Amino acid sequence: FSFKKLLDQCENQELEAPGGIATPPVYGQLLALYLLHNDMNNARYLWKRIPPAIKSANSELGGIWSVGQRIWQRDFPGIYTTINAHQWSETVQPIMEALRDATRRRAFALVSQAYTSIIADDFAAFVGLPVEEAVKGILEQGWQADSTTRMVLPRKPQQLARLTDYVAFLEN
């Protein structure tokens, strides 16, 4: 629930500024929050909104955009690869951990809905877990796995007041 206010407070801080340019630390917070909610349209325009002087001075903004670039092309293995490739500051560390976990639920829902049978090697890349781990995870959720083929088979497991409003409108 706390993620609702954090995104709004960073957006407002960018709107009003003492000199029209916001602080470097709040730029990374806004970019990370956009990626957490899968709002890639505003994140992409935020990258162009960052002045080149700020982007060149702070290398953190370049790194956070690398993670977003993977999400933009829907490169699931690259989302986990770039998240752990670099070390982030403490003010955006907890939300970026939530971004990595949020990507994990996105992969789980995508496989459960868009796949009737997915090979284990590709399925492990989607979730971001090692191949052996992904084998043990599915049975805990009831998903069937078959040996000698290494293939996973996922499957998805005031009316009265309103009505009198309709009549009153029609009868005037």
Partner 1 sequence: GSVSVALHPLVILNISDHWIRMRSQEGRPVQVIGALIGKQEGRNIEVMNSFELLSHTVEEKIIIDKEYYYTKEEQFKQVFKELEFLGWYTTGGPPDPSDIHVHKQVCEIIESPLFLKLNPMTKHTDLPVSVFESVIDIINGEATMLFAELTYTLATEEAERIGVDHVARMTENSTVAEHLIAQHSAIKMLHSRVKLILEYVKASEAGEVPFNHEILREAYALCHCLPVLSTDKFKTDFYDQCNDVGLMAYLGTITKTCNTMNQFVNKFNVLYDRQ
Partner 2 sequence: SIDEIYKYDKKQQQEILAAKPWTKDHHYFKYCKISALALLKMVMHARSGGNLEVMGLMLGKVDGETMIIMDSFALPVAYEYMAAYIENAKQVGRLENAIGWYHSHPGYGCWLSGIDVSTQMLNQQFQEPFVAVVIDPTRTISAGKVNLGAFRTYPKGYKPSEYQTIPLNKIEDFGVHCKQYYALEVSYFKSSLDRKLLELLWNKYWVNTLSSSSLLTNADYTTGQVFDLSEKLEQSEAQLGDKLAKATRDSCKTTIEAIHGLMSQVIKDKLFNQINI
Partner 3 sequence: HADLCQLCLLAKCFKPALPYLDVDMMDICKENGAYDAKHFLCYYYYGGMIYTGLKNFERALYFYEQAITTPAMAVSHIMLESYKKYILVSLILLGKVQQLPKYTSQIVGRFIKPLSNAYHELAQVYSTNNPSELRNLVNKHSETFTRDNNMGLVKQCLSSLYKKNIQRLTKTFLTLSLQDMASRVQLSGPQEAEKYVLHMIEDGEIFASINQKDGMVSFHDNPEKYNNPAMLHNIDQEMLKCIELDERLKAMDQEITVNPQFVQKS
Binding of partner 2 by 166 (CB under 8 A):
yes
Least separation in angstroms between CB 24 and partner 3: 18
Q: Which is nearer to partner 3, 75 or 97 (CB)?
A: 75
Cα gap 78→82, rounded to integer Å = 6
- Cα three-residue angle 3-129-114, rounded to 5 degrees: 75
Residue 152 CB contacts under 8 Å (≥ 6 apart), including other chains: 117, 118, 119, 120, 123, 134, 138, 143, 144, 145
Q: Choose the contact partner of 156 out of partner 2, partner 1, partner 3, none; CB within 5 to 8 A by kind.
A: none
Distance CA 41, CA 52 (A): 20
Near partner 3 by CB under 8 A: residue from 1, 2, 4, 15: 15
Shortest Å, Cβ 84 to partner 3: 24
Nearest approach in angstroms of CB 164 to partner 1 is 5
In the block, which residue shows the tokens 């309709």? 166
In the complex with partner 1, which residue's Cβ is closer, 113 or 159? 159
Q: Cβ 166 to partner 1, closest distance in Å?
A: 5
* Binding letters toward partner 1, positions 152-171, x by CB under 8 A: -------x----x-xxxxxx
Binds partner 3 by CB under 8 A, chosen from 41, 59, 91, 141: 41
Kindly tell me which of 114 and 170 has the beta carbon lying closer to partner 1: 170
CA distances from 26 to 11, 108, 131, 140 (A): 9, 31, 38, 41
CA proximity to 91, closest of 4, 31, 49, 16: 31
Residues that bind partner 1 (CB under 8 A): 159, 164, 166-171
